[PDB]
Design a protein around this ligand. Structure first.
Ligand code: FES
Length: 97
C-alpha cells in the first residue's frame, strides 16, 4: 500500500508516506522536497543515495552493477519502496565502482 520513507539529507531528516507504486524521488517532490536529479531514467549517478535500512525494488534502474547494489547504492529516480526505509541522499560525489 504505502510506506514510511525517512531521508537523511544534508540539511536535515524529513519523513513522508510513499505508495508502493511511486518512485521515491517523485514522492519526495510531491511533498515539496528538493532532491538532485538529471536524466530521471536510471542511467546516471546524479540521484544516488545509500540505503541504510529496509528493502527496495530497483528493477527499472540500469546503471549500477550487482556489486554496487549489494554495497547498498540506490538510484532514487527509479526505486520503489517495498517496506519502510531509511536512505541517505546527495551521495553522487561518493560513488565508486
Ligand atoms: S537522475 Fe539519472 S539515474 Fe536518477
Amino acid at each position: 500500500a504505502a510506506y514510511k520513507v525517512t531521508l537523511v539529507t544534508p540539511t536535515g531528516n524529513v519523513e513522508f508516506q510513499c505508495p508502493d507504486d511511486v518512485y521515491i524521488l517523485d514522492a519526495a517532490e510531491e511533498e515539496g522536497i528538493d532532491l538532485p536529479y538529471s536524466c530521471r531514467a536510471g542511467s546516471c549517478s546524479s540521484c544516488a543515495g545509500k540505503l541504510k535500512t529496509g528493502s527496495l525494488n530497483q528493477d527499472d534502474q540500469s546503471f549500477l552493477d550487482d556489486d554496487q547494489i549489494d554495497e547498498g547504492w540506490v538510484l532514487t529516480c527509479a526505486a520503489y519502496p517495498v517496506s519502510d526505509v531509511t536512505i541517505e541522499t546527495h551521495k553522487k560525489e561518493e560513488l565508486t565502482a
